[PDB]
Design a protein around this ligand. Sequence first.
Ligand SMILES: Cc1ccc(S(=O)(=O)O)cc1
Ligand SMILES: Cc1ccc(S(=O)(=O)O)cc1
Length: 227
Amino acid sequence: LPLLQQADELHRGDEQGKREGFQLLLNNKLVYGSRQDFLWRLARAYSDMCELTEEVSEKKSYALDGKEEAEAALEKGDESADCHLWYAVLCGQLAESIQRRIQSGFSFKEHVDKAIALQPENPMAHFLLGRWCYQVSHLSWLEKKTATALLSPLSATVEDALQSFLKAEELQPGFSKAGRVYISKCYRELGKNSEARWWMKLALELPDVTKEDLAIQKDLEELEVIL
Ligand SMILES: Cc1ccc(S(=O)(=O)O)cc1
Ligand SMILES: Cc1ccc(S(=O)(=O)O)cc1
C-alpha cells in the first residue's frame, strides 16, 4: 500500500520523520486497523516513539500501547516475521520488576526465535537475541533462582550471545555499534583477549544510532583499559 511505503520511508528517516510516521499511521488506524501489514508498522512506530522519548511515563506509554498493537497484528496470523520482531522489541522496551522482566523475557525469546525462523536473513533479530542471551547469562544467582521458579530453567550463555551477534555482522557488516561492543565483551569474558581487542577496534569505527550505542561507549572505554 502507498500508506505503508510512506510509513516505511519515515521509519528510516530522522527523529522528525519517525514522529511523522507515527502520527501518519495513528491517523489511519480507523480505516486500516484490521490489516496485519498496517498493525505491525503502527507497533514499530510506537517502538520508534519509545526509543526517541526521554520522559519515563511517556516512554512507558509508547511501549505499552505499541505492544497492544503488535498483539493485534499477531492475532491476524502467526507467519509474519515483522509481527514477531516488533512484538519482541516492544516486550523488551516495556520490561525496562524482576517478575515482570522474567515473564517479558520468556515472551521475548519465543517471538525473536520465531522471527529468526521465518526470516533468518534479518540481522536485527539476531542482534536482539544476542543481547537477550547476554542479559540472561549475566542474571544474578538470585534472579536465576526466581526465574527458574516462575517459568524451565534459564541457561543462555555468553557463547550463545556471541554466535547471535556475529550472525548479525555476517548478514550486515557494521549492523550495530552496541553489537560490536557486546562481541568484544563476550570475547573478553571467554578469555579470548586477542579477539576482544580486534572487536574493540572495529566497535570504535561505527557511529552512534541508538541511545544504547551512546550508553555502551562507557563499556567500550572500560575495555580499552582492561585490554
Ligand atoms: C505525513 C505526516 C506529516 C506530518 C504529520 S504531523 O506531525 O502530525 O502534522 C503527520 C503526518
Ligand atoms: C528471561 C529473562 C529474564 C530477565 C531478563 S532482564 O530484563 O535482563 O532482567 C531478561 C530475560
